[PDB]
Structures are given as structure tokens and as C-alpha cells.
Amino acid sequence: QISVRGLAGVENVTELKKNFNRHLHFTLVKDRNVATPRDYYFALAHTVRDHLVGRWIRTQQHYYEKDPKRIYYLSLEFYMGRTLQNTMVNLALENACDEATYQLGLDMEELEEIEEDAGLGNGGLGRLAACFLDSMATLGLAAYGYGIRYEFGIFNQKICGGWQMEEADDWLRYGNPWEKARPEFTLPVHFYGRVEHTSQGAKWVDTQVVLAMPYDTPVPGYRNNVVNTMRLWSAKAPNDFNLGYIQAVLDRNLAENISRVLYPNDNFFEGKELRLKQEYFVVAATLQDIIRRFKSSTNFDAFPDKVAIQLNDTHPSLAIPELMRVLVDLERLDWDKAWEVTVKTCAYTNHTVLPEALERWPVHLLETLLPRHLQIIYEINQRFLNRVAAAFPGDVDRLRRMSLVEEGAVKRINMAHLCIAGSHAVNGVARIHSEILKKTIFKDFYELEPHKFQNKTNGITPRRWLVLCNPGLAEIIAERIGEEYISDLDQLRKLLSYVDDEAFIRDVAKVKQENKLKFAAYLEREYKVHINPNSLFDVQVKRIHEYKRQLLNCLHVITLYNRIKKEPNKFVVPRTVMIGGKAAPGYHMAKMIIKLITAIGDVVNHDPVVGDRLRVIFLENYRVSLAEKVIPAADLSEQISTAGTEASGTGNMKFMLNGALTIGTMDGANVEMAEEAGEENFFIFGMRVEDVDRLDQRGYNAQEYYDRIPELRQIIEQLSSGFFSPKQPDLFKDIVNMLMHHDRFKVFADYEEYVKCQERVSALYKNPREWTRMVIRNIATSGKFSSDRTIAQYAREIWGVEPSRQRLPA
Ligand SMILES: OC[C@H]1O[C@@H](c2nc(-c3ccc4ccccc4c3)n[nH]2)[C@H](O)[C@@H](O)[C@@H]1O
Ligand SMILES: OC[C@H]1O[C@@H](c2nc(-c3ccc4ccccc4c3)n[nH]2)[C@H](O)[C@@H](O)[C@@H]1O
Ligand SMILES: *Cc1c(COP(=O)(O)O)cnc(C)c1O
Numbered sequence: 001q002i003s004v005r006g007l008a009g010v011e012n013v014t015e016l017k018k019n020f021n022r023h024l025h026f027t028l029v030k031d032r033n034v035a036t037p038r039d040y041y042f043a044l045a046h047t048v049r050d051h052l053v054g055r056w057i058r059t060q061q062h063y064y065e066k067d068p069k070r071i072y073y074l075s076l077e078f079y080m081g082r083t084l085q086n087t088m089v090n091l092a093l094e095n096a097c098d099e100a101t102y103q104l105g106l107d108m109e110e111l112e113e114i115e116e117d118a119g120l121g122n123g124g125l126g127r128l129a130a131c132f133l134d135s136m137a138t139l140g141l142a143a144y145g146y147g148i149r150y151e152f153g154i155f156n157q158k159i160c161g162g163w164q165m166e167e168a169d170d171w172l173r174y175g176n177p178w179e180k181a182r183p184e185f186t187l188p189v190h191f192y193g194r195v196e197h198t199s200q201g202a203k204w205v206d207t208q209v210v211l212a213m214p215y216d217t218p219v220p221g222y223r224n225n226v227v228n229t230m231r232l233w234s235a236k237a238p239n240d241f242n243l244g245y246i247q248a249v250l251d252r253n254l255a256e257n258i259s260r261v262l263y264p265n266d267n268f269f270e271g272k273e274l275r276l277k278q279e280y281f282v283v284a285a286t287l288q289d290i291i292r293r294f295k296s297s298t299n300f301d302a303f304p305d306k307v308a309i310q311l312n313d314t315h316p317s318l319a320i321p322e323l324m325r326v327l328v329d330l331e332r333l334d335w336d337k338a339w340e341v342t343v344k345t346c347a348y349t350n351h352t353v354l355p356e357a358l359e360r361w362p363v364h365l366l367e368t369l370l371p372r373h374l375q376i377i378y379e380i381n382q383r384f385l386n387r388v389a390a391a392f393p394g395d396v397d398r399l400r401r402m403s404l405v406e407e408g409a410v411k412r413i414n415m416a417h418l419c420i421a422g423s424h425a426v427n428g429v430a431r432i433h434s435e436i437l438k439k440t441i442f443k444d445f446y447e448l449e450p451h452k453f454q455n456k457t458n459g460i461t462p463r464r465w466l467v468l469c470n471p472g473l474a475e476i477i478a479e480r481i482g483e484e485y486i487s488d489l490d491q492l493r494k495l496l497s498y499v500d501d502e503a504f505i506r507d508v509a510k511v512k513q514e515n516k517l518k519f520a521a522y523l524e525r526e527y528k529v530h531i532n533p534n535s536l537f538d539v540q541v542k543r544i545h546e547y548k549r550q551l552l553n554c555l556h557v558i559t560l561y562n563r564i565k566k567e568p569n570k571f572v573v574p575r576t577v578m579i580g581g582k583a584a585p586g587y588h589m590a591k592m593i594i595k596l597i598t599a600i601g602d603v604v605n606h607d608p609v610v611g612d613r614l615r616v617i618f619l620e621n622y623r624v625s626l627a628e629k630v631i632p633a634a635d636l637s638e639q640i641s642t643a644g645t646e647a648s649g650t651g652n653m654k655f656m657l658n659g660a661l662t663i664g665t666m667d668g669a670n671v672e673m674a675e676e677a678g679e680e681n682f683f684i685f686g687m688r689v690e691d692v693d694r695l696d697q698r699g700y701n702a703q704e705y706y707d708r709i710p711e712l713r714q715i716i717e718q719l720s721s722g723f724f725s726p727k728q729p730d731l732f733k734d735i736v737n738m739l740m741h742h743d744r745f746k747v748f749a750d751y752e753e754y755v756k757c758q759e760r761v762s763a764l765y766k767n768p769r770e771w772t773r774m775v776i777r778n779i780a781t782s783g784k785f786s787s788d789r790t791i792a793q794y795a796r797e798i799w800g801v802e803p804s805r806q807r808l809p810a
């Protein structure tokens with residue numbers, strides 16, 4: 001059908017049909033008379049997976065022979081989503097498979113909807129790791145993603161009476177055709193025990209053993225025949241474990257619980273023992289694998305030339321003391337030499353400045369679970385603080401501030417400090433965030449070692465986030481500038497020469513319209529909900545957090561409603577306001593925000609005077625597969641965090657690439673997006689970081705805004721009085737009380753500017769041609785936000801390796 005989906009050659013289509021029928025019979029053990037759509041999905045998945053195998057084996061062979069420097073990306077989260085379409089895109093098989101399945105009497109798009117998301121992450125951090133793997137394969141890097149194979153990923157969200165309910169995400173129920181178990185490469189991981197000091201060094205003894213069994217998933221690059229590996233560890237008990245008899249076998253679950261479930265808190269640290277076990281499990285198993293591979297190339301001097309370890313936040317920070325443990329206790333290197341190797345091998349990426357997100361582990365947990373690691377951390381801390389003392393003599397407060405050990409009611413280890421001390425590079429994830437790190441929370445470290453601190457602005461993969469989810473847009477672009485931009489996104493700048501082209505303008509607008517119709521239909525079909533496809537689609541999708549200010553959006557929505565009720569017969573640009581995202585199960589305020597959004601919808605969506613001029617929809621169970629549907633349909637992207645709180649954002653970039661305009665604060669990567677596109681082509685409002693600091697200095701008083709803004713006062717009175725909850729008048733008291741007395745994120749402070757900016761949005765939307773021209777200016781300048789650009793910068797500036805676009809032989 002469409003060009004970017006590749007060729008449907010008669011030979012290929014014939015071979016796909018043959019192999020589809022073979023898998024249906026031999027693999028699935030079904031015949032066509034009792035096969036269901038799910039069986040058909042699996043037969044297609046197995047058929048496509050067969051095309052990965054040769055390339056996967058040949059890629060890994062090639063790395064063994066060439067022995068390039070290896071990049072190990074350690075993360076507790078990989079938010080992969082679905083694999084079938086991505087695989088077809090990257091192998092150029094989409095049109096051929098579409099043709100093959102069509103000839104068999106099947107609709108391939110229907111089969112694609114059967115696949116479960118692999119939801120092994122919470123949101124942005126997990127999804128960044130997934131984009132990065134795609135980019136590393138596309139750039140020919142010898143890269144490995146290492147993590148945990150959670151049996152249960154991020155929970156499925158149901159909304160019941162407007163309240164979030166959680167259900168386990170049993171993603172493996174029907175099998176995962178995209179992994180290969182590798183029980184033969186199972187490795188031991190040690191916990192508890194004690195340290196005994198011999199003549200010949202320390203020894204960690206009397207430990208409990210848990211086995212780490214790897215499952216390997218292929219990661220194909222874009223049309224280059226490179227297939228890299230994501231290796232995820234699963235926890236298994238040893239066979240003598242606990243070995244009355246029956247209970248001993250049942251108690252194997254104690255050990256196997258390590259890989260059972262993803263912790264579902266985004267940007268909130270909870271110091272639980274099970275989480276610490278997960279963190280050590282991934283690190284200990286991964287490092288044995290790294291060392292094995294290095295020895296199969298005595299002399300650890302060359303280790304940093306052959307290995308890079310990238311720590312995705314502090315979650316895998318135990319890699320630093322574990323590497324020291326292995327080098328010092330087992331390989332018997334002297335400390336100083338081991339430390340040199342460690343520093344040169346490890347690099348750390350920070351993703352947040354919110355204090356409650358920082359990992360600070362109680363010393364008593366480490367003492368019990370990882371006694372040798374605690375000893376090593378103390379020794380690291382003493383040597384590091386000796387350096388600080390020599391550089392800043394007499395500055396005793398600096399010593400207290402920079403220590404890895406935090407004193408207090410309970411002593412804790414600051415894992416960010418450990419990562420900075422033990423890494424040769426530390427980066428933030430957008431320019432403003434990297435600047436904040438140097439000016440505020442890591443100022444002392446930057447003064448000691450300025451050379452360590454870098455920026456690497458985040459990005460997204462244009463395979464998943466343009467070609468896959470928005471083929472219509474990819475096609476009209478390829479018609480003008482060819483296909484090369486899919487792996488070199490800077491080529492989208494060529495589209496600026498089409499901003500006055502009447503045909504292009506019409507086609508861009510047509511593609512958006514078709515995406516909106518398709519999404520509106522998806523809504524009715526699978527959620528019995530009915531929306532006006534000519535309305536402006538105003539979308540805020542992301543995890544629910546106070547810092548992301550879904551509440552500020554709610555205040556604007558109520559303002560619009562109240563203004564309509566005040567002048568019903570006045571024209572206003574029709575809107576469909578869609579808000580979606582998951583709340584962490586124990587985050588009460590986030591759960592109340594979801595309830596408020598559904599409560600607003602209950603009133604607004606059923607007021608006859610409003611008609612179809614304003615609809616408010618809560619999008620249930622937001623996840624990667626839903627993002628792939630809603631983002632291409634959006635007109636307006638809400639990126640409205642308080643300045644200084646969103647480290648980067650990546651949803652922002654997805655919307656920009658897909659033809660939405662952005663309303664946002666000067667926060668995270670929004671700053672760089674507006675710089676690339678031009679401020680005139682962005683809807684910027686609100687306090688800058690400097691304004692927030694000024695307000696904090698004189699003291700934020702929400703009452704002032706309530707007193708001076710009558711439209712705001714009216715909304716608070718509606719909330720307090722029970723307008724949005726007739727049967728439970730005081731339901732939203734916690735929200736009102738937070739807004740008035742304890743709002744860390746200054747919602748009222750940005751309200752007036754936000755409402756005014758939203759009026760400018762509405763005014764531009766009334767002029768379709770100028771709206772679309774501004775869209776083209778956004779799409780055309782989105783190239784910087786490719787994760788290929790991001791990964792090339794990590795490669796050159798941190799890992800010391802050169803990317804390659806050269807194809808391996810098929
Ligand atoms: O080994 C992992 C899984 O192995 C399946 C199996 N999987 C494969 C396989 C074969 C080829 C593959 C190519 C890329 C995608 C992953 C791939 C997986 N061969 N055997 C078994 O049916 C399942 O119970 C088991 O958990
Ligand atoms: O860099 C990718 C994204 O990382 C998000 C992020 N996610 C987390 C995160 C994610 C998971 C966590 C679980 C344990 C405790 C703290 C946790 C913190 N920190 N930062 C940022 O909010 C976003 O701006 C950023 O775009
Ligand atoms: C991109 C993405 C995120 C990150 O969105 P932000 O708006 O940057 O927080 C979260 N969840 C999913 C499913 C995503 O695809």
C-alpha cells in the first residue's frame with residue numbers, strides 16, 4: 001500500500017504464507033477450523049521472529065570476532081510495549097506481511113491488537129531505556145540492555161465509579177514469543193551472610209544463594225541487519241533450597257519473589273527490602289556476565305577499553321561497590337588499581353531533582369543484606385572525603401554535605417553521591433536540568449570535579465514514534481524528501497521549504513484529520529464514548545503527579561465550563577479535553593486527582609447547554625500501545641509542569657513529531673524544543689525557574705491569588721461546596737486544602753497566564769491554514785529530539801566509541 005512500509009515481492013509473500021501455515025500447524029498445534037484471532041497473531045509472530053534469528057546469531061558472532069568495546073546499559077525498567085510491528089518495520093517486512101495475511105483472509109491490524117504490551121516500566125525512564133536500545137542497534141553499537149524480567153509489569157488501570165482500581169498485569173499468561181530462555185547461563189547471586197577477615201583479604205561467607213536465569217530478547221536496528229540483545233534476569237531457588245519437606249518446597253517462593261513485580265512508583269523513593277534485593281540481583285548477575293565476556297576475549301588494565309557500564313539513575317548503583325568487591329576480593333587487585341578501573345568503566349545518568357525521588361538507603365538494611373558492600377562503601381567514602389579535605393581545607397560543612405553517609409535519626413547512604421564519586425561522567429537529561437544539577441543539588445561535586453559533568457538531552461526513536469504509529473504522516477513526508485530521514489531525523493529541516501506549499505498544507509491537515517477520526521472510532525468501539533472529531537483535541541497524557549499539574553489543566557477546564565454557562569450563546573472553539581495516566585497505588589493525592597477529573601466529566605459531559613462544545617474524557621490504562629494511538633490524534637500537547645521539576649520529558653517530543661502544537665512552561669526539554677522551533681511557534685507561559693526561586697524566597701501565599709482572581713475564587717467555592725460531588729459535598733476538601741495551604745507546585749501562580757495562553761491557542765485554531773503552517777514548523781525542527789542524536793553523543797562523549805550506519809550482510 002504505502003512506500004515506507006517496504007516491498008511486497010511475490011517470492012517473499014509466498015514464503016511468509018507457507019511459514020505462517022507451518023507455524024499454525026506444527027508450533028501452535030491448531031487447524032484453521034478452530035483457530036482464533038489469538039492463534040493467528042501467534043502464527044504471525046513466530047513467522048516474523050524466524051527472520052530475526054540468522055541476523056541475531058550473526059551479529060553476536062561478529063562481536064565475538066571483532067571484539068569491539070561493549071556497552072552495558074543497566075536499568076531496572078525497560079518499557080518496551082509491543083514488538084510485532086516494530087520488528088516488521090525494522091526488517092522492512094510490513095507490506096509483505098500485510099499482503100501475506102490479506103491473501104490468507106486476515107486483517108493484520110486486528111492481529112497486532114492482540115499482542116500484550118511488555119510493560120516493564122513506569123513511564124518516561126523505562127521508555128527512554130527502550131528508545132535507547134532501538135537507537136544503539138540502529139547505530140551499530142555492541143550494546144546490551146540488562147534488567148529484570150518481572151512476572152508482573154505496571155498494573156492495568158480500571159476506573160470504577162471514577163476511582164482507580166489496580167489489576168495485576170499478567171503479561172506472560174499466553175507466552176512471550178519474543179524471548180528465549182537461557183537456563184544454561186544461570187548464575188548465582190548472594191545475600192545476607194557475614195564478612196570474615198583472613199590473612200589473604202576479606203571473605204563473604206554464610207550467604208543465602210538465589211539463582212539468576214537469563215531470558216534474551218532481540219533488539220533489531222533499522223534496516224541494517226544488526227540484532228542486539230536485551231538480557232532480563234529471573235529469580236530461581238536452588239534445588240537444595242530449604243533442604244518439613246512440603247513446606248520447604250513451598251518456601252521456594254521467598255527467593256523467587258525477587259523478580260515477581262515491578263515497583264509502581266514513578267519519582268517516589270520507598271526504602272523496602274524487596275526493592276533493594278531487586279537492585280542487587282540485577283547488578284550481581286550482570287557483572288558476572290560482563291566479566292565472563294571480558295575474560296573470553298589477568299590484565300584488568302584494559303577493562304575500561306573493552307567495557308562501558310551506563311547506570312540508568314541510581315537504581316543499579318550497587319554496580320560500583322560490586323565491581324570493587326569482585327576486583328579486590330576475588331581477583332585480588334589492589335584497591336587503588338580497582339578504583340581506577342571502576343571509575344573509568346562507570347557512568348551515571350541522573351533523571352530527577354525532586355528530593356523524595358532520591359535513593360537514600362538505611363544503613364541497617366545494607367548491613368544485614370549486603371555486609372561486604374557496606375564496608376566497601378565506607379572505605380570509598382573515607383578516601384573520597386580525604387580528597388575533599390585536601391582540596392577545600394577547613395571546610396567542614398562541605399565534608400558533611402558531600403559525604404556518602406547521611407547522619408541523622410537513621411543513618412542512610414546517599415546513592416547519588418556514591419554514583420558521582422565512582423563514575424567518570426555524570427549527566428542530566430536536558431540542558432536546563434544539567435545546569436540545575438551544577439548550580440544546586442550537586443554544586444559541591446561540580447566544584448571538586450567539573451570535568452565529570454555533562455548534558456545529554458533526551459530523545460525518542462522515530463521508528464516507533466513516527467513510522468510505526470503515524471504511517472500517513474511518514475508517507476507524505478517521504479513523498480517530498482525521501483526515506484533517509486527515518487535514520488537521520490535532522491533531514492526534516494528540508495520541510496521548511498514546504499511551509500507555503502498549498503498541497504503539503506492540505507496533506508498535513510488531512511493526515512491529522514484521519515488520525516482523529518480513527519481515534520474517535522476507537523473510543524466509541526472499545527469504551528462506548530462519543531466525541532466530536534472537529535473539536536480541538538487537547539491532550540495531557542503522563543503519569544499522575546502533583547508536579548505535572550494535571551490540576552492546573554482541571555482549573556482551566558472548569559473555567560471554560562463556567563464561561564460557557566455564563567454566556568451560553570457566545571461562540572467558543574469546541575474542545576475535547578483528554579487526560580490520562582496512572583497513579584501510584586499508595587499516592588492518595590494522585591488518586592483524588594483522577595477522581596476529580598472523572599467528576600468534572602460527569603458534570604460537563606451531561607450539561608445540555610454545553611452541547612458538544614466541551615467534552616472531558618479520562619483515558620483509562622495509559623500505556624505505550626495507547627500512546628501510539630492518541631499521540632497521532634492530538635492537536636494540543638499539555639506540558640505544564642512547574643518550572644524546574646520535569647527533568648526532561650519525552651512525551652513532549654512525541655507530540656512535536658506527530659503534528660501537535662505545545663502549550664507549556666519553560667521546563668525540561670520544552671526549553672530546547674521552543675529554541676529549535678522558535679518561540680513564536682510554541683505556546684509558552686508561566687514562571688521561569690528564576691521566578692519560582694523569587695516566589696520561594698518571599699513565600700508562596702496561595703490566598704493572594706484566590707483574593708485577586710474572581711474566576712479562580714468561583715472554582716474553589718464550587719469544589720469546596722460540592723458542585724462536582726452532590727452526594728458527598730466534602731469529597732474534594734483534601735484538594736482544596738492542599739491548593740490553599742500546602743502547594744509545593746504553585747498551581748495558582750501560573751493560572752492567569754495559562755488561561756490567557758489557552759485563549760491564544762483557541763484563536764489560532766480558528767484559522768486552520770495558519771495552525772497547520774505552525775505545525776509544519778514544529779515537525780520540521782523536531783530532528784534534534786531523535787534518540788539517534790542522543791546515543792551518538794553518549795557514544796562519542798562518554799563511552800568512547802564511534803557509531804556506524806553501515807549494514808551487516810543479510
Ligand atoms: O526459551 C524461552 C522460551 O522458549 C520457547 C522457545 N522460544 C524460542 C525462540 C526461538 C526464536 C526466537 C527468535 C527471536 C525471538 C525470541 C525467540 C525465541 N525457542 N523456544 C519455549 O516455547 C518457552 O516455554 C520458553 O520459556
Ligand atoms: O529521563 C527520562 C525521564 O525520567 C523521569 C524520571 N523517572 C524517575 C524515576 C523512575 C522510577 C523510580 C522508582 C524508584 C524511585 C525513584 C524513581 C524515579 N526519575 N526521573 C523524569 O521525570 C522525566 O523528566 C524524564 O524525561
Ligand atoms: C513517553 C511516555 C511517558 C513519558 O511521558 P512524559 O510526558 O515525558 O512524562 C510515559 N508513559 C508512556 C506510556 C510513554 O509512552
